[PDB]
Design an enzyme around this catalytic site. Structure first.
Site, short mmCIF file in Angstrom:
data_model
loop_
_atom_site.label_atom_id
_atom_site.label_comp_id
_atom_site.label_asym_id
_atom_site.label_seq_id
_atom_site.Cartn_x
_atom_site.Cartn_y
_atom_site.Cartn_z
CD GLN A 32 -1.17 0.13 3.74
OE1 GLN A 32 -1.58 -0.98 4.08
NE2 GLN A 32 -1.53 1.24 4.42
CB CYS A 66 -4.76 -1.04 5.50
SG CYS A 66 -5.69 -0.05 6.69
CG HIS A 79 -3.39 -2.52 9.64
ND1 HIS A 79 -3.24 -1.73 8.52
CD2 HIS A 79 -2.77 -3.69 9.38
CE1 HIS A 79 -2.54 -2.42 7.62
NE2 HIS A 79 -2.25 -3.61 8.12
CG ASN A 104 0.01 -6.40 6.81
OD1 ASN A 104 -0.86 -5.55 6.50
ND2 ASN A 104 0.85 -6.16 7.84
C1 LIG Z 1 -4.53 1.07 7.47
C2 LIG Z 1 -4.46 2.13 6.99
O1 LIG Z 1 -3.76 2.23 5.97
C3 LIG Z 1 -5.24 3.26 7.67
N1 LIG Z 1 -6.20 2.71 8.67
C4 LIG Z 1 -7.55 2.73 8.42
O2 LIG Z 1 -8.06 3.14 7.35
C5 LIG Z 1 -8.46 2.11 9.46
C6 LIG Z 1 -8.91 0.71 9.06
C7 LIG Z 1 -10.06 0.28 9.96
C8 LIG Z 1 -10.64 -1.06 9.52
C9 LIG Z 1 -9.71 0.22 11.50
N2 LIG Z 1 -9.64 3.05 9.64
C10 LIG Z 1 -9.22 4.38 10.17
C11 LIG Z 1 -10.14 5.43 9.58
C12 LIG Z 1 -11.49 5.15 9.42
C13 LIG Z 1 -12.34 6.10 8.89
C14 LIG Z 1 -11.85 7.35 8.51
C15 LIG Z 1 -12.76 8.37 7.92
C16 LIG Z 1 -13.88 8.00 7.19
C17 LIG Z 1 -14.75 8.96 6.69
C18 LIG Z 1 -14.49 10.29 6.93
S1 LIG Z 1 -15.59 11.50 6.28
C19 LIG Z 1 -16.85 11.63 7.46
O3 LIG Z 1 -14.89 12.75 6.21
O4 LIG Z 1 -16.15 10.95 5.09
C20 LIG Z 1 -13.38 10.69 7.64
C21 LIG Z 1 -12.51 9.74 8.13
C22 LIG Z 1 -10.50 7.62 8.68
C23 LIG Z 1 -9.65 6.66 9.21
C24 LIG Z 1 -9.18 4.45 11.73
F1 LIG Z 1 -10.37 4.22 12.24
F2 LIG Z 1 -8.86 5.68 12.18
F3 LIG Z 1 -8.34 3.53 12.27
#
Ligand SMILES: *CC(=O)CNC(=O)[C@H](CC(C)C)N[C@@H](c1ccc(-c2ccc(S(C)(=O)=O)cc2)cc1)C(F)(F)F
Ligand SMILES: *CC(=O)CNC(=O)[C@H](CC(C)C)N[C@@H](c1ccc(-c2ccc(S(C)(=O)=O)cc2)cc1)C(F)(F)F
Ligand SMILES: [Ca+2]
Ligand SMILES: [Ca+2]
Ligand SMILES: [Ca+2]
Ligand SMILES: [Ca+2]
Lengths: 215, 216
Positions: free
Chosen positions: B20, B26, B163, B183
């Site tokens: 990635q 991820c 993640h 991964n």
């Molecule tokens: C892994 C990687 O590369 C980054 N990690 C993530 O994407 C992680 C995976 C999940 C399964 C734990 N999710 C992160 C994350 C979730 C959601 C947002 C986000 C979604 C929508 C909006 S919006 C309302 O502006 O459309 C803003 C942010 C960001 C990150 C987390 F939860 F932080 F780990």
């Protein structure tokens, strides 16, 4: 699009609710938009159930927070959302107890307002109905709002942390505003409402994460 | 009752490990892996799907800023399709949505969620369906520097999912039950890009807290 609109006058908005300590503002915002569409489609105004969303929208985090689109998708996939009378608010996340017999509305999808586009939000409020919106509600000034058109440049449009409902818009003394219904009780703000500055460069990020249900 | 062990890599349901890069994508790699497994299962063809298509077009997520797999499955369903990696290559940065219907290579009829925290249900889902998208707490330095063996660390935090990865199977090694995890950090990371994570050790790292797979 009219220069001012107010869905409360037309009977598309239910009474102000109080979410309590629970981070369920997204459920109250979603239900308020669904309530408006339901009135539009059937001529009936009734309370829909935020608890149903808190307990059953697995995409969201219950009292830990959530997004409104996930709530609309759940009602769509679930083929219904219960009325508040069939699934009362309790203020804490519990196991899903959805009841098809208590079904009061359906959803055919959702539409998002393009990010930062206040003009699009305004057309939606005018031609569709109340629109779910997210804003920065972290300031003490918003929290102690009482009257007038609220505006603060300390509002951080990049710090969205609260969901509310745009039920109309207009002008008061030459000041453009959004009519915002909150879920902090009838005593917060102005009988549970706040006028938020409109067209002042997307103040408080009001058009940054707006959406409404399709019905 | 499900088999004592399952490894979909032996069934040809899994594409090579991808990298990635610095993008917070991820979730898109985990989504595409789960879709690639159902595509192979239903058509017999294994091919790379496009994470970039998800990063650029899933408005519910935040592109390289992060996201969730269920939002990605919901986009493929609503979009009526997802492009192959070949029709929409990975570039590692957010770009304008340039989905090409002519390059569509898979579709989605929705998704199914694993009940939360239930490693038993996750094991039965993997055996019955194929690879399942899962989220974990990958923040620990022991995780980032994992090399081999069944990974377990008591400080892993189940409520801090940050993640997304892909459970392609499960089994046991040296007496320790495990989840086989693909991964999206390149083949040099871990064991040829994979990690064995402890199974039935009270939902270690939150492996069963946010598991889902696409319906086809
Ligand atoms: C892994 C990687 O590369 C980054 N990690 C993530 O994407 C992680 C995976 C999940 C399964 C734990 N999710 C992160 C994350 C979730 C959601 C947002 C986000 C979604 C929508 C909006 S919006 C309302 O502006 O459309 C803003 C942010 C960001 C990150 C987390 F939860 F932080 F780990
Ligand atoms: C207002 C209120 O009571 C709490 N605020 C929010 O719910 C706020 C509303 C948006 C519209 C600004 N959202 C917060 C939030 C969003 C998403 C999560 C979340 C969803 C799902 C999961 S999961 C995948 O592990 O099930 C985990 C977390 C939590 C909070 C935000 F964004 F932080 F402001
Ligand atoms: Ca939970
Ligand atoms: Ca100030
Ligand atoms: Ca978006
Ligand atoms: Ca969603």
């Amino acid at each position: 699009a009219p220069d001012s609109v107010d869905y409360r006058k037309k009977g598309y908005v239910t009474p102000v609710k109080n979410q309590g300590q629970c981070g369920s503002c997204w459920a109250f915002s979603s239900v308020g938009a669904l309530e408006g569409q339901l009135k539009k489609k059937t001529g009936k105004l009734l309370n829909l159930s935020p608890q149903n969303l808190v307990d059953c929208v697995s995409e969201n985090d219950g009292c830990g927070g959530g997004y409104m689109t996930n709530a609309f998708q759940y009602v769509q996939k679930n083929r219904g959302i219960d009325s508040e009378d069939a699934y009362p608010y309790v203020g804490q996340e519990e196991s899903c107890m959805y009841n098809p017999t208590g079904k009061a509305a359906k959803c055919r999808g959702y539409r998002e307002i393009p990010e930062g586009n206040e003009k699009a939000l305004k057309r939606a409020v005018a031609r569709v109905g109340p629109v779910s919106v997210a804003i920065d509600a972290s300031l003490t000034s918003f929290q102690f709002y009482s009257k007038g058109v609220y505006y603060d440049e300390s509002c951080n449009s990049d710090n969205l942390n609260h969901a509310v409902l745009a039920v109309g818009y207009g002008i008061q003394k030459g000041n453009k505003h959004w009519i915002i219904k909150n879920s902090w009780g009838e005593n917060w703000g102005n009988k549970g409402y706040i006028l938020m500055a409109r067209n002042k460069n997307n103040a408080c990020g009001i058009a940054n994460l707006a959406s409404f249900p399709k019905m």
